[PDB]
């Protein structure tokens, strides 16, 4: 009784007229399926394939998003943490100044925090502004008899902009601290952006191919069994593992997906390990008090040579915890694409009393074919589909173009060089 399909099709929601009791005899399904049912069942067959794959790898999209939101929130907090800590130490020792000149540190980090969150891309002039704002106020402390009305309404570019080769008031501290601050803001940024792509990459990469060549005769896999015979013959592994590979042999991100998690860990280690953050959290205060000491004993040369013109939330999780917590989440992601076919053929299919044989392309006959191929050279011997001459598809092949430059952008940033 083909009406066994009728109730099963009623669960899927078909208008059960002209399908219950009648069977007659770039295409599909060589049957108790009507003409318009076929054209509408392949569309129904494709739907689960998308929803199954996207839900299968859905946790990579959520993990990279969760680590992003918790790493991005971490860096912003430690910027605000160090801003408040630098004010405490400098107010204790010196009761002569800084009593009402802590307003510069607010404008210092705020422009630093714009380089981190891409709000701006100007840091070399940003630091020169800060050193100048300190330069035009410490300078008169050892020159108290003199008073200075600045030139025009702005002293200069930013008073002694050091351009054109001024004998630096703070000798080497501006260059040294710039090198230490620059390597930090760019390393913590290429890491966050790298995670930001990873979410976007896998999110759109999970949107599954339409591949009409794969879609047509995909119905043969699981759909057309319902059309002719009873639906109790859920397909076994042999047939399944090749149609899901042949339809997905394009998205072979495996060569470019491995180096990505490598660069994520490599940059994380240099960033987790000191010299990239917690050192430059206190290095600012050390070099500032060191540069002023150079000034104190080298002001005789510079001041004499400058007679001319004007002269509540939960505290940031420890980065070490945030790194091995990051490391564990990523361990289950490296060999993900190779293990993707097993999960897809390991859900609705009970392959894991009745029998072992299952449905095949043209009957219930026994199957013993091969089923490992995963790239164009490997899937050129495709028994059940027609993979493209070069496996990678036109939009995907553009996900190994702008979505692996971050790896080199994270690797180079881990060295100190950027752009």
């Amino acid at each position: 009784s083909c009406a066994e399909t009728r109730q099963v099709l009623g669960a899927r929601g078909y208008s059960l007229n002209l399908i219950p009791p009648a069977l007659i005899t770039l295409r599909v399904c060589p049957t108790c399926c009507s003409s318009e049912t076929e054209q509408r069942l392949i569309r129904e067959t494709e739907a689960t394939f998308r929803g199954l794959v996207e839900d299968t790898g859905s946790f990579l999209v959520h993990t990279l998003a969760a680590r992003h939101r918790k790493f991005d929130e971490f860096f912003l907090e430690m910027l605000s943490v160090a801003q408040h800590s630098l004010t405490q130490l400098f107010s204790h020792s010196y009761g002569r100044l800084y009593a009402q000149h802590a307003l510069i540190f607010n404008g210092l980090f705020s422009r630093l925090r714009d380089f981190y969150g891409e709000t701006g891309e100007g840091l070399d002039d940003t630091l020169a502004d800060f050193w100048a704002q300190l330069l035009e106020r410490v300078f008169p402390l050892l020159h108290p008899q003199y008073s200075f009305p600045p030139d025009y309404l702005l002293c200069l570019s930013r008073l002694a902009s050091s351009t054109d080769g001024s004998l630096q008031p703070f000798g080497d501290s501006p260059r040294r601290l710039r090198l230490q601050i620059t390597r930090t803001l760019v390393a913590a940024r290429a890491f966050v952006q790298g995670l930001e792509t990873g979410r976007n990459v896998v999110s759109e990469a999970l949107k599954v191919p339409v591949s009409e060549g794969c879609s047509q005769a995909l119905m043969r896999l699981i759909g057309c069994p319902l059309c002719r015979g009873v639906p109790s013959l859920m397909p076994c592994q042999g047939f399944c593992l090749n149609v899901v590979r042949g339809c997905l042999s394009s998205r072979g991100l495996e060569p470019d997906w491995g180096n990505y998690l490598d660069g994520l860990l490599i940059l994380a280690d240099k960033l987790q390990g000191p010299f990239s953050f917690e050192l430059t959290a206190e290095s600012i205060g050390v070099k500032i008090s060191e540069g002023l000491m150079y000034l104190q004993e080298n002001s005789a040369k510079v001041s004499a040579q400058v007679f001319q013109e004007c002269g509540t939330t939960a505290a940031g999780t420890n980065l070490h915890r945030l790194v091995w917590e990051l490391r564990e989440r990523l361990a289950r992601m490296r060999g993900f694409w190779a293990r993707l076919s097993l999960t897809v053929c390991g859900d609705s299919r009970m392959a894991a009393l009745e029998a072992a044989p299952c449905w095949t392309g043209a009957g219930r006959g026994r199957y013993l074919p091969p089923v490992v191929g995963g790239s164009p050279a490997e899937q050129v011997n495709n028994p059940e589909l027609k993979v493209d001459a070069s496996g990678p598809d036109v939009p995907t092949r553009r996900r190994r173009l702008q979505l692996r430059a971050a790896t080199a952008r994270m690797k180079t940033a881990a060295l100190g060089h950027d752009l």
Epitope: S58, F59, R69, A314, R332, R339, T343
Partner: antibody, heavy 119, light 108 residues
Framework: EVQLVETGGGVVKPGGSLRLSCAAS????????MSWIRQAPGKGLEWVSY????????YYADSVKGRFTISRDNSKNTLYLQMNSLRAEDTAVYYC????????????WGQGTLVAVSS | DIQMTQSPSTLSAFVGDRVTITCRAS??????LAWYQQKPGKAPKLLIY???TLQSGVPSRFSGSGSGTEFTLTISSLQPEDFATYYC?????????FGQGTRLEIKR
């Protein structure tokens, strides 16, 4: 489809030991983070433990730090929980859940099986 | 060591009304907040995670918007199968804490 079935007795006196199994099917057990959340006869839900997918990181609540132990079996696809020397306060309905990927969200919960401590 | 709160404890509303459930936390939580629905004596469902994002299968009538220490959960048009107990969660600290449920009953 995605199924989390729990088993284990629930009627023991103070000092008795119970172990619960959270048999999982419908998805690869090795990818996701698992956890245990209990619901007392009261309204609120209390968190007790959680374990990494590989099993490398284990967390216990402050009220279950010494006498509680959680394990894992990615081959059999089963989540366990060792309940030892439970006090009367441990009386609750114990669920097992799966972390969808985002930190501490539980999209799929178990049917529930209750543990009772009484003399 | 972290406290979660909800309001109100019990809200009476008709089928087809607009319902807003407010959750309040002790300390700041940027976007780490989850919502759950629990019918009597059965397993809870995941409604809204990450403050504002909906879970697959949850209808469009469920909405949640919050940033900081004040959060809400909105039902645009109440359908008869929405009468249950709704729970708040935390996704930041090591001791994750739920808020006591808000019971949504039928008005009569």
């Amino acid at each position: 489809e995605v199924q989390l079935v729990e088993t284990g007795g629930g009627v023991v006196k103070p000092g008795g030991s119970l172990r619960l199994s959270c048999a999982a099917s419908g998805f690869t057990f090795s990818d996701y983070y698992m956890s245990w959340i209990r619901q007392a006869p009261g309204k609120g839900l209390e968190w007790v433990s959680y374990i990494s997918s590989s099993g490398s990181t284990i967390y216990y609540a402050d009220s279950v730090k010494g006498r509680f132990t959680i394990s894992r079996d990615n081959s059999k696809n089963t989540l366990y929980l060792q309940m030892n020397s439970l006090r009367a306060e441990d009386t609750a309905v114990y669920y097992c859940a799966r972390e969808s990927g985002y930190d501490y969200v539980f999209d799929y919960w178990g049917q529930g099986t209750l543990v009772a401590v009484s003399s | 060591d972290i406290q979660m709160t909800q309001s109100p404890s019990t809200l009476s509303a008709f089928v087809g009304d607009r319902v807003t459930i407010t959750c309040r936390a002790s300390q700041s939580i940027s976007s780490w907040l989850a919502w759950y629905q629990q019918k009597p004596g059965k397993a809870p469902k995941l409604l809204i995670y990450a403050a504002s994002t909906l879970q697959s299968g949850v209808p469009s009538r469920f909405s949640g918007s919050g940033s900081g220490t004040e959060f809400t959960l909105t039902i645009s048009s109440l359908q008869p199968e929405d009468f249950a107990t709704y729970y708040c969660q935390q996704l930041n600290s090591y001791p994750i804490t739920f808020g006591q449920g808000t019971r949504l009953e039928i008005k009569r």
